[model samples]
Target chain A: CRHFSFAEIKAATKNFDESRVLGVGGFGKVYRGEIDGGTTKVAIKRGNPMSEQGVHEFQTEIEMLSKLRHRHLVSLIGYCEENCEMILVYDYMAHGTMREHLYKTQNPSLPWKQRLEICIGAARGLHYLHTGAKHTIIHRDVKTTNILLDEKWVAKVSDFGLSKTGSFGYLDPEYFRRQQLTEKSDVYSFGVVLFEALCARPALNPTLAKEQVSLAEWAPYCYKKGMLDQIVDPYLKGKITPECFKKFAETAMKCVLDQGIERPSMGDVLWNLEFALQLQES
Target chain B: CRHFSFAEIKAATKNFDESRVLGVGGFGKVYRGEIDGGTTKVAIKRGNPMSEQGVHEFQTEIEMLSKLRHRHLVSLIGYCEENCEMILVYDYMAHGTMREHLYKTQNPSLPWKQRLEICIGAARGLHYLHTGAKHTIIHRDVKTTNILLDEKWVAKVSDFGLSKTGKGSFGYLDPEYFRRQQLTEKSDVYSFGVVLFEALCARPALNPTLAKEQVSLAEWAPYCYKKGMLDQIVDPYLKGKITPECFKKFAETAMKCVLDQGIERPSMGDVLWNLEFALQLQESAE
Candidate 1:
């Protein structure tokens, strides 16, 4: 619950330059900035008053992240909340988001190994959220974009606005009809996003993209139809063996099963994902 | 903290009948059960054995919601995290969710007045998240589905999985970027856009049915245009009175404020002022 004066934040961000801004969302603005006296370069999130989600995200990060201790999670330093203003300061990651490499229009493409590393890093972070943390967190809106990368290419899961900490998917079967949010709900979303990582495709295909079927429904169906050789990322089709490919594809499908009960817990997912990686190493 | 053994939960649920089941998500099953020796009915959520998110959500709710207290927020009662099993129990709502009312096929329709009351109650819940709670929370997925209606038809915001607190959106967002999971003031602005529009139309348009010509592009367009054509943007049959040019401008500015910091939109305080005025006008017309 450290506080940063508005003036200090303003100085760090050069008055929140539009250009320095990395991205804007339903909650607030994320700015890439530098601090001289503090001897640090950081990413500062400035919350908006008009957006309740932003306010909630700010509150979630401040209250939840401040107390959370993890190597995979992003470190939130100080924040400004006086005078009805909410701002969060975090350690700036040198490498941007994992999505930048996975789904961006312009970037050096990710190698199979680097992509696998990102997946493992993200899995570890989710593992911390699921098993290692004193309190498990369901990052409801887990996607490629939320996975941030540091200088060492480590993954830190951010954005708790859509995060929940209850039984996620199948645990609460009534959740869909009742509109219950849970951690497994995040796992389902994560599986969809993970497809993007494996296929180098959008979670949901863009209007301009040529594919017809829903990536999630279609991906698994094709795998079921004995098309594992045809459906995987072209880069890894030959490099990885048939069994490894089958495992990754099948696991992704299970993560997104229509019945939430079929999805794997983050703990199980880490082990399954590790097996896939080991196959590559073997 | 309160840990309920599987045997106790089974006894409370009476062997988990389909009637006891309330809903299911990617996590597992949410069942309505009697607790405290039948003195209270609670919503008990059991994680899917295979769900990764459930494992995490179980821990998150126990950690955060147990510590949180508020009138508008859902109360977290207890949890069970043993033997690879994860479950949580919360106060159950008799009236179901705002979605049941908004979705015509789901249940009894919510009248305009009830809808307004629901909207206001939801706003209060969001207000608690935004400004009142010790740590502000971002209900990242703030759609109609998450708004639960209590026995008295009062609204309580649930689902903290996608929620973030502190230094987040006050009431602003950008559309294309926000959904991409950018987590900024702009993202919240966009969510408020859907929420405000839902109040006006009595439904949420996040996953609107899209047609080629009649797509919801109008959502992204500012309703505060100086031109008379903007009047077409509001729901018809309101006699051009349920919402006025100013209120539309408030919504538009809020949507645009987080659009860009250089051209910052009006503050959230300003946005709420217009909504209050709109609420008053609706009351008078009624």
Candidate 2:
């Protein structure tokens, strides 16, 4: 809620100490820092000029999120878009990220209840973009890393910069080689995310030894071979309800279908997730 | 076998009359011709220097077919590969290619019986490549256009120029892209499946026309929908005996085999199950 001077941010981070750095992605580095005279901590995401698309993503996040508001959606406090130093600030969550929780630390166990909550929260946010908001938004890329967990352990979808409003995954297989993006694209990406959720695997896992990265190719094979259950996180074995598990599996299956037209609307997906939860409650 | 010298070939068709030219394709000109000995007519497939892959095909056909022999495969009577100009001489069938028979001609009456035979003949040839030979061979591209016919109306598989021993589709593509011309038994199987399915539909089984060209969007839509059966779009004209599960399985296997990685598909022996299942259902191809 407060804008600290660049000088203060530099001081808090100890001139961008490597220890304070959160992570680096396709765009740039994310660092954690605190403001003077305030205990509040914030995550500072900076953009690198090395890429043109990264610059577009920087502008995209600022323009798109400025107009959107929802409980499950990530909250943007403020952004600094000037010269080459483009930065976005968001409410800091104590929990690292879904990716870190599933792959990095290996300490936190994602219980069935938490996965369900994350699923419902994400679906609700997607449903809002599809039906609730004035303009339909299709998240082109939906993965564990983009999902943030707040203090109360609530899911807030992040990364609007990659969202494509109507079209999604224009190149799935049934469409033209260069088709336009559509809502189905979101479904395709969400399908991959849902798959990662069910399997408790990274959406794109690079083999550290060989450097050959292909999560989609390997992921689909799991579905085809009927080995979906083999890849689940060892932590949650008997904790989840069958109805919940089935719904989740089915949802992921739908997302990974070869044809995009057959995918259900985000609103429908939300209904399915909610209904599944209700079935569990009953 | 004579070269049919340029002069004789010129006389055969009015000095390469543009009008007499049957058609032009990715490789060269197809001209209808006659052998002076008798009423034996033929389609002269002449190679052009402009063809990017044609040169390789020309060299390949000349090198491979010279010694290879098979009844189901088309016969190569004579060729001209010495003068940097590649040419092939063959006995022609009246009905034209299987592609023209099934789709191009209006009668569309190739009928289920004839179509079945075509499938059996082509599959038999493919089966030969997979296991009939001492060593396995792969037909890099196995579409209907490549299938030719003879006087007795017997289907003959031709065009080995692009053929390789055991390769898959030619290049690496997206999670969506599944090929990179790597020769493998599955590669031929995959192309054969596309031809078989499209023989009825005559369209790219995977591509759909939206308000604009949007193959990727249409493809991803089904995954998002999750109904499972994505290959029901095969041409409806052929009333093949395909059961719901069979059709579903056929689509499933064919699509999976076409994945850029050959590992995702079943082995050739396993693919035989799909072929046998398809054959048991009906006497039709495409």
Candidate 3:
């Protein structure tokens, strides 16, 4: 792991000029810039001084991200700490977030086949978290927004700040009762993402009628009523095979089941997505 | 530079059992234990959860230790930060701190020549910090307790809690730097000046039992040296031990270090030169 001087970070992003800003989230603004004398393109995450995330989270993210390495895991190039500023440098993911391509954004829609492949990539990445390193690495926030794609559209998991507790019914009720987190909480959140992909809507859409606001609750209700096709994205109407669709719905619903013990392990979910990809061809 | 898993640390320290404790200082308890499946001995320093100091000091120690290495500087073997617990692993110094042998402990008194030799090793260590490394590495704290002796009796500097990129051994603190809050390599020289006097006198830096004027060894030692009365306060055990010429050179260098102004103090290299000459003077006398 390398320590980037704050001057280098400032130079890379023109002292964090607004023009270089990529996107803003819970942590703060991410800027697209070059480091190492303009040789490497990077996505620089600068924390808002007022952001709730404190030094604990900053140091925690550095320690965990610096130690973890996987093709599917976003590469943490380095970090800079000075003047109370905490910034993270990452390998720039060109396609932006999986959410930007999903809904509520004017970006061109990803076709059904491409979405399935993205899901498989994300699933593989999540599976690696459960087994890749010497210990279990649970990505506490497994939402679509945290799944990033580089120039090759390869999905690498990003944003490990919350990995400290090191996830939600989309939070496990058992988690609320036990005040504990297991890999299963992440499994639960990932399942909601699977449904969000099928529906092409966010896990929670507050503007919708209350009953349909949560896709986790609504889509499975739709799937069980034999009306699953009614809520799926219209653009995907004739694009997916019936057999593959059934397998995906089954796999995703099993993930968000109320009981954590009953939820499929990330390994099970990965193979299910793999078979669903295989079924798309069959 | 190594990261020891919390489990491994717990195993080595026997879950931090009180019986294995080595010492308790400002940070907290230190446990004496064996790691690497009992093949290696280590001193484990665990910080108090409520220590006034926090992440900045923890990381500073790690960053400094990961880069600096010398026979005279104590080695940081590994570190553990988990479950809100911060611990440092070090190469266990069998003879403990130089202060332990100086006074206020059951440890046997070191021979005058051995003390001079240890001071030389320590001076060499500080000289390396100020010059040997490509960059200047100031040891923010340089009191006797921070100097350790291995089983072979080689001296090494330790303790980086108050370091910048550096003191509560308040008596050893540099008066000018303390007043201005401006630190420099000379600041270490002043503290080490106190350390030198303490070794010669075998007394605490601040002895409340002494009269008001003589309470701080810093005030009394320099005054005594100037009055040509350092002969009166030399550790009684070393009554006829130190060669007269050696004592003159050693006391002069130490007195120059604690001079009122940083500009007046000799650099650590100059200190090593004088101390080495003192040792040579003692050897020539024998």
Best by lDDT: 3
As a whole number from 0 to 100, the lDDT of residue A101 in candidate 3 is 89
C-alpha RMSD in Å of predicted model 2 compared with the true structure: 23.2
Better of 1 and 2 by TM-score: 1
Query: Per TM-score, what order, best first?
Result: 3, 1, 2
lDDT of 1 at B97: 74
Which 10 consecutive residues of model 2 chain A have the lowest summed lDDT? A166-175
Compute each candidate's TM-score over C-alphas: 0.47, 0.45, 0.51
Error of 3 at A160 (Å): 42
Question: Candidate 1: misplaced stretches above 4 Å?
Answer: A36-38, A166-175, A178-180, A206-213, B1-286
Q: Weakest 10 consecutive residues, lDDT, candidate 1 chain A?
A: A166-175
The Cα error of candidate 2 at residue B152, in Å, is 67
Q: List model 2 lDDT by residue over B1-286, tens digit each.
A: 4466665666666767888688786667878877785476777787886676877787787665654445556766677654466778776755567776655467565654466567656665665456433356776667667787766667777888867764112211123223344446766665665555555444443443543332432233234224653434445664454455555545554555455555566654445445545554543333
Q: Write the per-residue lDDT of candidate 1 for residues B62-111, one digit (tens) a residue.
A: 66676554455677778876667777888888887776665444575555
Worst 10 residues of 3 chain A by lDDT: A164-173
**Residue-wise lDDT of candidate 1 within A1-282, one digit each (tens)?**
567888988989989899889887556788988876857989988778667777777777777676554556777888997767788888888888887886556877777667766776677667556543334577766777778889888777777665555222112333556575556666677676667777776665546335433566667767778874575667655776666666677778777876666677764565566677767677
